C-alpha cells in the first residue's frame, strides 16, 4: 500500500561539501540516522554528487 513517508533533507558529511539534499520518500524511509550520509548515497541522480550545487530552499 502507500506508506505515506515524508521527504527529508539530509546533510552531506563530506567536510568539503556539507550540502543539504532533499530525499525521495523512499530514500527518506531508508536513511540510517545513526550513520554518516554523503551525496553519493542519494538515489536522486540530479543531486547525487558533491560537485552538484545545492537545490533551492
Amino acid at each position: 500500500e502507500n506508506m505515506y513517508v515524508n521527504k527529508v533533507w539530509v546533510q552531506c558529511e563530506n567536510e568539503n561539501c556539507l550540502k543539504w539534499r532533499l530525499l525521495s520518500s523512499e530514500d527518506s524511509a531508508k536513511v540510517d540516522h545513526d550513520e554518516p550520509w554523503y551525496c553519493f548515497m542519494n538515489t536522486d541522480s540530479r543531486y547525487n554528487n558533491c560537485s552538484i550545487s545545492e537545490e533551492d530552499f
Binding site: 533533507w9 539530509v10 546533510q11 543539504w20 536513511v31 540510517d32 540516522h33 554518516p36
Partner: peptide, 6 residues
C-alpha cells in the same frame, strides 16, 4: 545522518 523534516 543529520536530517530536517519538510
Amino acid at each position: 545522518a543529520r536530517t530536517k523534516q519538510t
